């Protein structure tokens, strides 16, 4: 079990987005190019908008990995701010400490 249904959704999304990365890239090559004619690019356009909607990366969310919180995340530990503090304050995060200066 992932902690939340939402997290589940996200796992799927990352899987699909991993699978179609090659197709998406190859097509958006054509799409993003001035050199090729527009007639290729409109077909290529429908091509990439044909692809399953959950395969596109912008639909991914970086979520807290233990607690599933959608924001207030620190990218480095993939941790919610709350869970991060909870680990660091027991000193289970090496080299992390309160800051005085």
């Amino acid at each position: 079990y992932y902690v939340d249904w939402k997290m589940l959704r996200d796992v799927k999304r990352r899987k699909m987005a991993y699978e179609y990365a090659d197709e998406r890239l190859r097509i958006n090559s054509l799409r993003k190019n001035t050199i090729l004619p527009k007639d290729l690019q409109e077909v290529a356009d429908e091509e990439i908008a044909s692809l399953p909607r959950d395969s596109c990366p912008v639909r991914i969310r970086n979520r807290c990995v233990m607690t599933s919180r959608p924001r207030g995340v620190k990218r480095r530990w993939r941790l919610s701010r709350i869970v991060f503090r909870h680990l660091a304050d027991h000193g289970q995060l090496s080299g992390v400490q309160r800051a005085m200066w």
Binding site: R76, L93, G95
Partner: protein, 132 residues
């Protein structure tokens, strides 16, 4: 009032480990880090991995040695091997202790795909820093 990772003052009878008697603002000042690994240093990678690994180890160890864990775990990571070091109450017969040592070390070695060492230090009763 800050509450984080604190053990509040009771009527004055409460036994408190050296660890538990020091609030987060004392980390790196008086008490030290319960883990050691390269990941949180300036130019380094995979901090996240090691954090999750850590969390799972504390949970796992706490469940594998029920009731006999004295203080929180110490996790040293060196050049791809993790030495877990624990303070253990004497509860079990040394048969059960060695069984669990071997069982654990093998299990976790196959889980995390790296050599795992386990070092048990045995103690009569929870070492007491304060009150009591």
């Amino acid at each position: 009032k800050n509450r984080a990772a604190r053990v509040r003052v009771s009527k004055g009878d409460k036994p408190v480990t050296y660890e538990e008697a020091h609030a987060p603002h004392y980390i790196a000042h008086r008490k030290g880090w319960l883990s050691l690994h390269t990941g949180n240093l300036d130019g380094e990678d995979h901090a996240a991995e090691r954090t999750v690994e850590d969390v799972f180890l504390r949970k796992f160890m706490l469940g594998t040695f029920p009731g006999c864990l004295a203080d929180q775990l110490v996790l040293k990571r060196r050049a791809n091997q993790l030495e877990i070091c624990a303070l253990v109450l004497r509860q079990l017969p040394p048969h059960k202790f060695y069984f669990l040592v071997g069982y654990s070390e093998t299990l976790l070695s196959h889980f995390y795909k790296c050599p795992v060492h386990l070092h048990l230090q045995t103690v009569p009763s929870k070492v007491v820093y304060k009150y009591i």
